[PDB]
């Protein structure tokens, strides 16, 4: 593949460098619980003026 | 200044050995590069936009290996001039050299 060829004479050939597959995953997030307090904000009685 | 006269010639009388060193580089440090590692790495959402310029990859590639046996082909050259090897005398007895 690295060759673009389906014929190879001797040599070193020095391909690609290898890797290892990350088979897992895993999620970090800080210790929080309570909701946002999005009603005091959206649903507000009162505005402010511009 | 030179004392030049028209008659007038100037002989040595004695001599001295002398001894200098030369240096002069042979070869570089052979390198190589892994173009797709070094620019996207671990990830998957790159080395997909990197077929297009896959080509110009295996261009560096091959130019670097070009180096790499023209530094080869140097580091023979230089030294394996002659190829039987001869192993160093025994009894010196050079005649008062010191090749020690
Ligand atoms: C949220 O807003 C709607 C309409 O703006 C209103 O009917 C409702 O009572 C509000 N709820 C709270 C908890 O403020
Ligand atoms: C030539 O030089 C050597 C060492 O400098 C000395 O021993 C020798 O006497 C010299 N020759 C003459 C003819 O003076």
């Given at each position: 593949?690295?060759?673009?060829?389906?014929?190879?004479?001797?040599?070193?050939?020095?391909?690609?460098?290898?890797?290892?597959?990350?088979t897992?995953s895993?999620?970090?997030?800080?210790?929080?619980?309570?909701?946002?307090?999005?009603?005091?904000?959206?649903?507000?009685?009162?505005?402010?003026?511009? | 200044?030179?004392?030049?006269?028209?008659?007038?010639?100037?002989?040595?009388?004695?001599?001295?050995?002398?001894?200098?060193?030369?240096?002069?580089?042979?070869?570089?440090?052979?390198?190589?590069?892994?173009?797709?590692?070094?620019?996207?790495?671990?990830?998957?959402?790159?080395?997909?936009?990197?077929?297009?310029?896959?080509?110009?990859?295996?261009?560096?590639?091959?130019?670097?290996?070009?180096?790499?046996?023209?530094?080869?082909?140097?580091?023979?050259?230089v030294?394996?001039?002659?190829?039987?090897?001869?192993?160093?005398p025994?009894?010196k007895?050079?005649?008062?050299?010191?090749?020690?």
């Amino acid at each position: 593949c690295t060759l673009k060829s389906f014929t190879v004479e001797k040599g070193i050939y020095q391909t690609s460098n290898f890797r290892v597959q990350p088979t897992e995953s895993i999620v970090r997030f800080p210790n929080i619980t309570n909701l946002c307090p999005f009603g005091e904000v959206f649903n507000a009685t009162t505005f402010a003026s511009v | 200044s030179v004392a030049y006269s028209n008659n007038s010639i100037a002989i040595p009388t004695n001599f001295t050995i002398s001894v200098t060193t030369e240096i002069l580089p042979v070869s570089m440090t052979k390198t190589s590069v892994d173009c797709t590692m070094y620019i996207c790495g671990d990830s998957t959402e790159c080395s997909n936009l990197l077929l297009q310029y896959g080509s110009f990859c295996t261009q560096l590639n091959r130019a670097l290996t070009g180096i790499a046996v023209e530094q080869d082909k140097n580091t023979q050259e230089v030294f394996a001039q002659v190829k039987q090897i001869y192993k160093t005398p025994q009894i010196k007895d050079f005649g008062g050299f010191n090749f020690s």
